[PDB]
Design a protein around this ligand. Structure first.
Ligand SMILES: CCCCC/C=C\C/C=C\CCCCCCCC(=O)O
Ligand SMILES: *[C@@H]1O[C@H](CO)[C@@H](O)[C@H](O)[C@H]1NC(C)=O
Ligand SMILES: *[C@@H]1O[C@H](CO)[C@@H](O)[C@H](O)[C@H]1NC(C)=O
Ligand SMILES: *[C@@H]1O[C@H](CO)[C@@H](O)[C@H](O)[C@H]1NC(C)=O
Ligand SMILES: *[C@@H]1O[C@H](CO)[C@@H](O)[C@H](O)[C@H]1NC(C)=O
Ligand SMILES: *[C@@H]1O[C@H](CO)[C@@H](O)[C@H](O)[C@H]1NC(C)=O
Ligand SMILES: *[C@@H]1O[C@H](CO)[C@@H](O)[C@H](O)[C@H]1NC(C)=O
Ligand SMILES: *[C@@H]1O[C@H](CO)[C@@H](O)[C@H](O)[C@H]1NC(C)=O
Ligand SMILES: *[C@@H]1O[C@H](CO)[C@@H](O)[C@H](O)[C@H]1NC(C)=O
Ligand SMILES: *[C@@H]1O[C@H](CO)[C@@H](O)[C@H](O)[C@H]1NC(C)=O
Ligand SMILES: *[C@@H]1O[C@H](CO)[C@@H](O)[C@H](O)[C@H]1NC(C)=O
Ligand SMILES: *[C@@H]1O[C@H](CO)[C@@H](O)[C@H](O)[C@H]1NC(C)=O
Ligand SMILES: *[C@@H]1O[C@H](CO)[C@@H](O)[C@H](O)[C@H]1NC(C)=O
Lengths: 1020, 287, 49, 46
């Protein structure tokens, strides 16, 4: 009877208080949405890695449990039973029954150690067995399994120290459930009190990984990249060469007589199996050290060039058999390389080498001209000269016999007793081997991702036939990345190819968690035309960017909503006959319209409209400073002293930060402080019937901002004085602002206040409304607004009587256009993004203080409370290096952002100079259409431009001619074009229909009427 | 390596940052393309009757007899640059991965994303721009497209530089001949783009050096996690794996910083291109 | 001013405004708070059985 | 001509700080390779 647990089974991983935080932990948790087994109204189940036991009960039928490997008297078992009066815990060698129940559970309890007795509607328990400790977490909750979420609390941790693989329930109607735990990653959430009230299982779904990455329980509309497609290995493989014999341990460790240290011995070991367990009952070693390998890994390796050297030395000289030693033995007798790879073994032999009265059969060298080289032997017998006095064989007072003898007596001190020494040297994982360990081979598996162990080399991947020809002396094959790609099987001698079994990118499209919980997944390296996927479905659409699974294809074309790639977007249907879903289509390019061209036809506007458009540009970003000592060391004098060995690395950062900070003021200065004359608004507001009240300064506010400026300043959400006592205590635990500056990260105020910026903008507006463009070129000169507008109309190719005859229409159009903008400004992302980025950059810096950087902890106080000076100088430096790298990265990104902001500020300054202080002829620089004028408004950290443009409308069709032939001469319009309504011919202007009589004043003649193509006739 | 994966959690806040930067760059590229090409959202069809005062535009207008709608000069341009592809796991499984050099990159986690606009869509935009500018002049870049004969448009343009229009109406044939010859010379020269090739070369080299740098030891006893883990127990192997992790994180950081610095310059060039389009193609320039 | 001179590694400073270290305060005394326990650990039983 | 002088000053400052940064220990026992190699053998000096 199977059942689904939804989110049951979450306990506290530590004993530390946390609140108002999100924490990512790793432990043995019960996977979300896993199937548990249901038992109603008593078998033996396995105990794999832990058990999540839950019991819906009303009358106390479930009493306890028993744990063990086999439940008879050949092993130890744990009893946790609740009798009617007491709870008894015992760890003994019990003899149990097929069916135990309550009190007839066992028959005999022979011998045992642990004992705890006295201890005079839905229950959930978690059991574990780690490092010899049996841990239990439990919780009870009053009201088949229900929904909800609850976290279990630690109960006990028994030191039983036994081996557990099976468990059984004790019953005395009721039901219980059983689910196993696996090692997974979970994202928990602590509420204001410290209680866990939510969790996320990373790698349970494709959208669950994204939540863990963002470290949030919500996701916004878009497309996100997840980890590549992963494949786990199916089985394991072991392939050693097939050898039978056993290595000659007896001949080496058991010989009758050993060699002298000066004439040490050396023999080769090959074609055997290294199994040192056979020495556990005959030989005990006082010294055993290995150098290039771990003692616990010797059983799983193979060795290439094995040798064994043996000699005899006295007791206290054993410390000289090591790579970097000096003394009598290491100098003249036996030396090891500094890159030694092997093991050294020594043991006491006072029983076999000591004779009564002195044994003199072991010698050593005492005099030599120079030191030996590694693995060099010297068995000479020449007399040694030590005083520059010549001696040809004779001896005395200057010349000695090089070799001295050991005196080994049975009653010597342990420092003067004989020791037998053996040194083994070899190589690992490079060439063919013939000496292996005690491991059993398995079969060869191809075309699957499996674990392997080839001659001691372990890894994962897929095996495949290969077409390479290794030479007889080669075993492995590498690539440019230096990883093993091919291997020769040590039994069949065939060559294989090793390939990684993880491949391909993945992405997830989501419409927003506030909207729906369904998603689509794009497999970017799969062709479904299916297999390398997490799930198939009813609808599977194949694009040229990948295989989209979870969206329904449609044949219409809309504008892009979520760009997927290669000309395909996605959108949420929601509003449709079907409940809701995701759709995939191809983006549209804008509804191809028409073209109506001929060699004698033209279109001329008969009207126009006045339009006002808005443009936004960033001008500045935030200024910050850093106290490197306070960020890296906190308040530790030891760290402060250790940091001086990185002295020239903080001034370097502060110089760049100061440069950016002083650049920001120049950015603002160049944009806003162009005119250094402050013009006041006129006292009487009368400008040819144009209404500016919604952009001029308003003095009915705490500031002198205009209506549109006030609307703008509320659409971006944010100097200040934050006092030490302001966030003293708990308030610093949630502020998120003085959490920054408790670590040395400040924010500096701007040099110009928003009031001054608004004053500059008001001066600009007053100047440009009262003078035109004269104040930008010199002394401001007054001119009526209607005449200024006539000038600006003359600047775009239209006569001024056109304005003087439609003044009222133009004024009304402008007033309505100005009203529409403030109507639209009701409910600035380019300006908001700067603030968001500057805040996130500073918050990640504080977040990155919880990393270890390879040390034992990230808390200097914890490190210094347990370790002394020398042992702490090694752990502090890693944190110093990591925390310096963090600041360097932050500063580099700040510089790269400041460059872009400066580019934007320069563009804004040029725009001010060319659109606000004059009229522009460049196309599309100050709006869309023919530019007339523009007004600046200030926003937070930016500027806003209101561009007024002239747009023609209501065109009509006319026939036209390039020239007119009157009486044998050719006439040209001299301004504008010739048009005809069907019987009459007129001359007009390009941008407005206004026909006139063709005469000599509006015409010039520079032809003969013989060559022009398209000439008509009529008359002038 | 699961052991390395578990040891890497003590640098968790260093991968999301790199991915955020790379995602910012990738999003910026599509905006760069849009601001340059999608200036007009009205697609204009090529004229059905090609009668422009004797001017020959056949070499630059769309060709409807190709698998795409690219023009002759556009095809010549596309053939001169040597580079949105599906590479499958079964495609380079075996010894092929030792020479492909493309799926050697993506066995180590390095991937390339397709652009949002395809070459066919870009060519459609360009064709619309050409048709608009040849049939309307410069009115379509300011509002409703108003038609005008090409010769009269060219007379306007002569007036724009201080020369009277009769100077054009009396030399139309010679001017058309000169324009046709000049157009022919360009396609003659385009027979056998180093500014555009360098972008591809730089990106490929930057991606290849990253794969090459995986053989560095960085102070450890070997640059192979399997080799390190086949000989040392946990305590002794953590020390070696930490150095490798440090070095490889540093390599990734350097790559990302260089990518950001290159993206800035590409953006400056794209802004120049968009301004140049607006001022030289949709109008007549006095600068 | 002396901190600024030490940072610039110069005996003269030019006109301007410079940033110095944050405001620091030193501790006045020391505190110890362990639990109140009287008995002595059983060394005899363990090391002398 | 401060705008032109600043570039020269910046380049000189950068190249001089590069040289000054050779006297740091970076966590070692000395900042002089000769001193390190005159007292420690190969294994301890690596
Ligand atoms: C009383 C004389 C003091 C010596 C002068 C100081 C330093 C000389 C250099 C090294 C110290 C000598 C150590 C000798 C003991 C080791 C002998 C050996 O087994 O090799
Ligand atoms: C286990 O119990 C038996 C009784 O049969 C006893 O002989 C033996 O010594 C006990 N083992 C231990 C370790 O106490
Ligand atoms: C949790 O804390 C809040 C205030 O922070 C308090 O109002 C609430 O009572 C607390 N919860 C419990 C269970 O006490
Ligand atoms: C070593 O020799 C002794 C006596 O010859 C013998 O008892 C012992 O078993 C031998 N050990 C091995 C490992 O051969
Ligand atoms: C090797 O022989 C040469 C010549 O006799 C001698 O100078 C040198 O010292 C010898 N090498 C060693 C390590 O003694
Ligand atoms: C997928 O495979 C089919 C079968 O050959 C092929 O026609 C198609 O082009 C492939 N997909 C892509 C995107 O090329
Ligand atoms: C021009 O447009 C305005 C506003 O739409 C309108 O009031 C006016 O009548 C139009 N002129 C003509 C001649 O239609
Ligand atoms: C200008 O607009 C404001 C706000 O709409 C209005 O109060 C004012 O009366 C208008 N100007 C005139 C002259 O009416
Ligand atoms: C001018 O004539 C063309 C060709 O018939 C037509 O498509 C166009 O709509 C006409 N113009 C107007 C303003 O109707
Ligand atoms: C336009 O072309 C037609 C076709 O030949 C011709 O009849 C007409 O005169 C031309 N008009 C002009 C103005 O050249
Ligand atoms: C223009 O008038 C002349 C006579 O003055 C006539 O011969 C000529 O044909 C006319 N134009 C055309 C195109 O018919
Ligand atoms: C325009 O060029 C094409 C291709 O070079 C040519 O076939 C055509 O004849 C040219 N135009 C004319 C009017 O000949
Ligand atoms: C351990 O027992 C011996 C025997 O009585 C005693 O002399 C000694 O003092 C004991 N240890 C200590 C620490 O007193």
């Amino acid at each position: 009877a199977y059942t689904n647990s939804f989110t049951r089974g979450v306990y506290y991983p530590d004993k530390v208080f946390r609140s108002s935080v999100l924490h990512s932990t790793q432990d043995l948790f019960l996977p979300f949405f896993s199937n548990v087994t249901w038992f109603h109204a008593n078998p033996v189940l396995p105990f794999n890695d832990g058990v999540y036991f839950a019991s819906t009960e009303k009358s106390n039928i479930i009493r306890g449990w028993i744990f063990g490997t086999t439940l008879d008297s050949k092993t130890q078992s744990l009893l946790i039973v609740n009798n009617a009066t007491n709870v008894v815990i015992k760890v003994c060698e019990f003899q149990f029954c097929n069916d135990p129940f309550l009190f007839r559970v066992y028959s005999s309890a022979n011998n045992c150690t642990f004992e705890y007795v006295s201890q005079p509607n839905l229950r959930e328990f978690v059991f574990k067995n780690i490092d010899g400790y049996f841990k239990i977490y439990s919780k009870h909750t009053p009201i088949d399994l229900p929904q909800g979420f609850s976290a279990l609390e630690p109960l006990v941790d028994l030191p039983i120290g036994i081996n557990i693989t099976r468990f059984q329930t004790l019953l005395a109607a009721a039901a219980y459930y059983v689910g196993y735990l696996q090692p997974r990653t979970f994202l928990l959430k602590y509420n204001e009190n410290g209680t866990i009230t939510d969790a996320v299982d990373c790698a349970l779904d494709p959208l669950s990984e994204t939540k863990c990455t963002l470290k949030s329980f919500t996701v916004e509309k878009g497309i996100y990249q997840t980890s590549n497609f992963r494949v786990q290995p199916t089985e394991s493989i072991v392939r050693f060469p097939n050898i039978t014999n056993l290595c000659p341990f007896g001949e080496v460790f058991n010989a009758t007589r050993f060699a002298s240290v000066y004439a040490w011995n050396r023999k080769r070991i090959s074609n055997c199996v290294a199994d040192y367990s056979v020495l556990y009952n005959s030989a005990s070693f006082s010294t055993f050290k290995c150098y290039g390998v771990s003692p616990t890994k010797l059983n799983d390796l193979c060795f290439t060039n094995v040798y064994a050297d043996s000699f005899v030395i006295r007791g206290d000289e054993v410390r000289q058999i090591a790579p970097g030693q000096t003394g009598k033995i290491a100098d003249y007798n036996y030396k090891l390389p500094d890159d030694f790879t092997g093991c050294v073994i020594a043991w006491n032999s006072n029983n076999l080498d000591s004779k009564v009265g002195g044994n003199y059969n072991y010698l050593y060298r005492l005099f030599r001209k120079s030191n030996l080289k590694p693995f060099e032997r010297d068995i000479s017998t020449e007399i040694y000269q030590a005083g520059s006095t010549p001696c040809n064989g004779v001896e005395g007072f200057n010349c000695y016999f090089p070799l001295q003898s050991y005196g080994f007596q049975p009653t010597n001190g342990v420092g003067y007793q004989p020791y037998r020494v053996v040194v083994l040297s070899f190589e690992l994982l490079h060439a063919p081997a013939t000496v292996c360990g005690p491991k059993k081979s398995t079969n060869l598996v191809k075309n699957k991702c499996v674990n392997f162990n080839f001659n001691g080399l372990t890894g994962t991947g897929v095996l495949t036939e290969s077409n390479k020809k290794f030479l007889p002396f080669q075993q492995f094959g590498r690539d440019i990345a230096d990883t093993t790609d091919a291997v020769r099987d040590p039994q069949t001698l065939e060559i294989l190819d090793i390939t990684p079994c993880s491949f391909g990118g993945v992405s997830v499209i989501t419409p927003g968690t506030n909207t729906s919980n369904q998603v689509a997944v794009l497999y970017q390296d799969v062709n479904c035309t299916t297999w390398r996927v997490y799930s198939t479905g009813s609808n599977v659409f194949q694009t040229r960017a990948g295989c989209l699974i979870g969206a329904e294809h449609v044949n219409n074309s809309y504008e892009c909503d979520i760009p997927i790639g290669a000309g395909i977007c996605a959108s949420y249907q929601t509003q449709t006959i079907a409940s809701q879903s995701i759709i995939a289509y191809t983006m549209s390019l804008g509804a191809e319209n028409s073209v109506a061209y001929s060699n004698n036809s033209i279109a001329i506007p008969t009207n126009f409209t006045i339009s006002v458009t808005t443009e936004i540009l960033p001008v500045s970003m935030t200024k910050t400073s850093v106290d490197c000592t306070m960020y890296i060391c906190g308040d530790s004098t030891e760290c402060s002293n250790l940091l001086l060995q990185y002295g020239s690395f903080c001034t370097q950062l502060n110089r760049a930060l100061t440069g950016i900070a002083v650049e920001q003021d120049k950015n603002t200065q160049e944009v806003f402080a162009q005119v250094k004359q402050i013009y006041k608004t006129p006292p009487i507001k009368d400008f040819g019937g144009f209404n500016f009240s919604q952009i001029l300064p308003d003095p009915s506010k705490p500031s002198k901002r205009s209506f549109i400026e006030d609307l703008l300043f509320n659409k971006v959400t944010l100097g200040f004085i934050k006092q030490y006592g302001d966030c003293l205590g708990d308030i610093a635990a949630r502020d998120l602002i003085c959490a920054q500056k408790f670590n040395g990260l400040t924010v500096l105020p701007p040099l110009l206040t928003d009031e001054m910026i608004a004053q500059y903008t008001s001066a600009l507006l007053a100047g440009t409304i009262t003078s035109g463009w004269t104040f930008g070129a010199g002394a401001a000169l007054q001119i009526p607004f209607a005449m200024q507008m006539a000038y600006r109309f003359n600047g775009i190719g239209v006569t001024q009587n056109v304005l003087y005859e439609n003044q009222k229409l133009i004024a009304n159009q402008f007033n309505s256009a100005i009203g529409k903008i403030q109507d639209s400004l009701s409910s600035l992302g380019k300006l908001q993004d700067v603030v968001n980025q500057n805040a996130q950059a500073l918050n990640t810096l504080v977040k990155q203080l919880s990393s270890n950087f390879g040390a034992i902890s990230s808390v200097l106080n914890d490190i210094l409370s347990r370790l002394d000076k020398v042992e702490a100088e090694v752990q502090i430096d890693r944190l110093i290096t990591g925390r310096l790298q963090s600041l360097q990265t932050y500063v580099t990104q700040q510089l790269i952002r400041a460059a872009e902001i400066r580019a934007s500020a320069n563009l804004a300054a040029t725009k001010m100079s060319e659109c606000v202080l004059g009229q522009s002829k460049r196309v599309d620089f100050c709006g869309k259409g023919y530019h007339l004028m523009s007004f600046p408004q200030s926003a937070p950290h930016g500027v806003v431009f209101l561009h007024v443009t002239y747009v023609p409308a209501q065109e009509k069709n006319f026939t036209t001619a390039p020239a007119i032939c009157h009486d044998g001469k050719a006439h040209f319009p001299r301004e504008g074009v010739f048009v005809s309504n069907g019987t009459h011919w007129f001359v007009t202007q390009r941008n407005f229909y206004e026909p006139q009589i063709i005469t000599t004043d509006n015409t010039f003649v520079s032809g003969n009427c013989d060559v022009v193509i398209g000439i008509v006739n009529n008359t002038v």
